Design a protein around this ligand. Structure first.
Ligand code: HEM
Ligand code: HEM
Ligand SMILES: C[C@H](O)[C@H](O)[C@H]1CNc2nc(N)[nH]c(=O)c2N1
Ligand SMILES: C[C@H](O)[C@H](O)[C@H]1CNc2nc(N)[nH]c(=O)c2N1
Ligand SMILES: CCSCC(=N)NCCC[C@H](N)C(=O)O
Ligand SMILES: CCSCC(=N)NCCC[C@H](N)C(=O)O
Ligand SMILES: [Zn+2]
Lengths: 411, 407
């Protein structure tokens, strides 16, 4: 069964066969589309199919499908699962697995880079302090003094679900949020809850607008422990505008390294509950969302005021006009400081290229339109005009519940 | 089976129960989401009639009444005897208002109940259609204080006597492929323009030529008519601060009136049912003016503003996009022709969503279409989960007639 996607700017038609390899559900039925819904212990029995399917993919990719080495590996895993109920990935399989989770991440616009990923095998890790050292090295390697490099650190897999490694931070580097007695928020409102947890655990909050949160690290199902990332390892960029000299006086800055730390990596049925990964920002992530969401730093008003726009009526498009200048500022700042960043024209154009290549070479590219289209200027980016097919391939990055909701406290 | 939608900006959660009354299929499976694809007999008719009339009689709070049973019987007798049935005026108006109500791709639905329905089921010729259409245009334009309307021509019979408006909108600009190699006018209309010329239209060959209507009655060959020029309200585009903007020579029409869709009410098919509301500014400024395959004017505007077009990262496209849109709104407001900006329209739709959740148990909405093509996340709909499903009565796409019509 062939499926066709069309681009309404170019009339290019592509044909998807890869969707035939999807197994996981989408959330949609023949009767309902949930395309815009944000979030729509395994047995021996269920594990070996998942192992076998993964190893078959791995062996095809290395052109060793059906080989003695492929067959031995299958039997070895079968027998490992039979006697221990789980199995260990070879290093080569882990790397391949992590690259594929990224390749399959349908909400990621940066996927052209999927093949260049530094994998840090942290499976020998046993303690939170151990995790801290791994994460510091990941932060330093990936930051590379502004010349950012994609990387992922993979801590030991779930066993019985009572021994999970988890990073409680949603990103390795993020700013504290503080709810005040008067209902206002200081810092990042997205991070108030986790900030509170950090404080409760013993962190001494500076209580400013850009405090880098401590890492809250859980090893082997134990209670989590706090660590300050060395500040000299935390690369930040002060935000200024090329023509507006008052912009710097807003006091904005941002960190250079986006590193998602709250997701679950699934490879061959095995579950890697701590697997922080990082790439580099697309400018709109900061300038549109983190700065201009009403539930984030919400700076549209202050900027518009400083620009002396007509704010009496929405139809003067003041919000839209402030928005462009803020994003120009973010891109200008990062580039002036030689910290990697990609604008949304460049990133979406790169993605279209990657996506076509993927159709030719792989028979598809699952893509979530709702997520891939940038949150400003949607239709002047080629992705807006691009029909996409969204479906679930393994290996994959999954969401998982926040740990404070599930963790069994040891004391 | 009962479904939650969350707003991620406000944390308000609504519970959808309306999707269980869902009839048509979506394109999506449990395996694959097609949310971003643009186009994903007597025994058939009687359930469809029953379903609609049950909902109608429920709406005037007379469900299961004698008058309800009587009508079901009447319609049933009529279908068995004539293979079809006719809607009472009341059922037609309610059907039209509700097709708009169910239009999951329309952000303007807070207005759904204020709709003028012109019953044109007594029309028999293309000339009649032309008269009805002019009258719709004039009524809806209303010297710029636009008013929503639909004109409804006779329903499909044996499918060989369809009424069709061949135009995609009542009012559109022509598109011409030139010897040069470029396109003059609106590239989206190039093919339909050729059909006008081949049918006999005398094209003025300009950038903003209003197309002639190509009207088909009773399955006959379509015929050409020019809308009286004095009935087509248009707006010259100027910017409140860039005096040079006028020199681009841009204009647009005030009346957006979609003419190529099919209205389905209670299993009956109204294949000619032009309907109109009024524009959201981004439709013209972002899509019509800046789409690469439309008038594609970003480069020229950016050139006049003296932006650095050396690199994508100066956001010169984005800067010019905002200005082009400020000019559209400003020009329409200055001429007192109804227009709505994307902030105001999306805010309205959110209020409408809440109304429909609390009074109906849901509101089908297509997020891909609802979120404006500019500044998406600074409009509240961007943050609003939406469930998309298909309810009837409905507006539906249908194949262009030049592929269907046997001359
Ligand atoms: C190298 C440059 C990269 C760029 C420019 C990029 C771009 C993006 C953007 C803009 C998002 C959406 C962020 C949001 O809206 O919150 C995203 C999401 C995502 N990316 Fe990337 N990405 C890059 C690298 C990576 C890497 C290295 C991985 C993993 C190895 C990855 C996997 C993912 C996943 C799983 C998501 C979904 C996150 C979520 O759903 O919250 N990306 N990407
Ligand atoms: C009164 C003010 C109205 C506003 C502000 C409005 C807004 C919109 C917008 C922005 C779209 C998307 C159009 C596009 O992107 O091409 C749309 C589509 C649509 N609207 Fe409206 N609309 C209005 C009136 C109406 C009326 C009167 C009807 C029916 C009687 C209607 C039914 C529809 C339908 C069926 C679509 C989908 C058309 C398509 O798929 O191309 N709307 N509307
Ligand atoms: C409700 C809606 O799905 C939600 O706002 C989504 C829309 N698109 C997005 N796209 C990106 N890249 N990131 C997001 O957080 C979201 N949020
Ligand atoms: C492929 C994609 O569905 C297509 O570009 C859609 C996206 N969203 C849209 N939204 C609206 N309102 N109108 C459109 O024409 C489109 N086009
Ligand atoms: C970690 C791989 S994906 C890299 C990326 N470009 N975005 C990650 C999310 C960042 C978030 N939107 C923020 O603005 O903090
Ligand atoms: C007719 C009911 S919906 C009214 C509307 N606001 N738009 C309809 C489509 C117009 C198109 N997007 C254009 O830019 O011409
Ligand atoms: Zn779907």
């Amino acid at each position: 069964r062939f499926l066709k996607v069309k681009n309404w700017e170019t009339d290019v038609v592509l044909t998807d066969t890869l969707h035939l390899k999807s197994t996981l559900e989408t959330g949609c039925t023949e009767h309902i589309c949930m395309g815009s819904i944000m979030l729509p212990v395994r047995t021996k029995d269920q594990l070996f199919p998942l192992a076998k399917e993964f190893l078959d993919q791995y062996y095809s990719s290395i052109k060793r499908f059906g080989s003695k080495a492929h067959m031995d590996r299958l039997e070895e895993v079968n027998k490992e699962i039979e006697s221990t109920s789980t199995y260990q990935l070879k290093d080569t399989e882990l790397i391949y697995g992590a690259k594929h989770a990224w390749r399959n991440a349908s909400r990621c616009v940066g996927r052209i880079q999927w093949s260049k990923l530094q994998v840090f095998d942290a499976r020998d890790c046993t303690t939170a302090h151990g995790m801290f050292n791994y994460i510091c090295n990941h932060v330093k390697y990936a930051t590379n003094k502004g010349n950012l490099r994609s990387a992922i650190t993979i801590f030991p897999q779930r066993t019985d679900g009572k021994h999970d490694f988890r990073v409680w931070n949603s990103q390795l580097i993020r700013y504290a949020g503080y709810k005040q007695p008067d209902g206002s928020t200081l810092g990042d409102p997205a991070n108030v809850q986790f900030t509170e947890i950090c404080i409760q655990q013993g962190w001494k909050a500076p209580r400013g607008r850009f405090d880098v949160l401590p890492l809250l690290l859980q090893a082997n199902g134990n209670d989590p422990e706090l660590f300050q990332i060395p500040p000299e390892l935390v690369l930040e960029v002060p935000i200024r505008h090329p023509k507006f000299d008052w912009f710097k006086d807003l006091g904005l800055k941002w960190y250079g390294l986006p590193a998602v730390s709250n997701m679950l990596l699934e490879i061959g049925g095995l579950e890697f509950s701590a697997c922080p990964f990082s790439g580099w920002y697309m400018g709109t992530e900061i300038g549109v969302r983190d700065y201009c969401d009403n539930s984030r730093y919400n700076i549209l008003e202050e900027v518009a005021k400083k620009m002396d726009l007509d704010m009496r009526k929405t139809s003067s498009l003041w919000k839209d006009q402030a928005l462009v200048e803020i994003n120009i500022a973010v891109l200008y700042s990062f580039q002036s400081d030689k910290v990697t960043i990609v604008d949304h024209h460049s990133a979406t154009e790169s993605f279209i290229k990657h996506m076509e290549n993927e159709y030719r070479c792989r028979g598809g590219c699952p893509a979530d339109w709702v997520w891939i289209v940038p949150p400003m200027s949607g239709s002047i980016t080629p992705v807006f005009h691009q029909e996409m097919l969204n479906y679930r391939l393994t290996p994959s990055f999954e969401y998982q519940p926040d740990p404070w909701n599930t963790h069994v406290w040891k004391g």
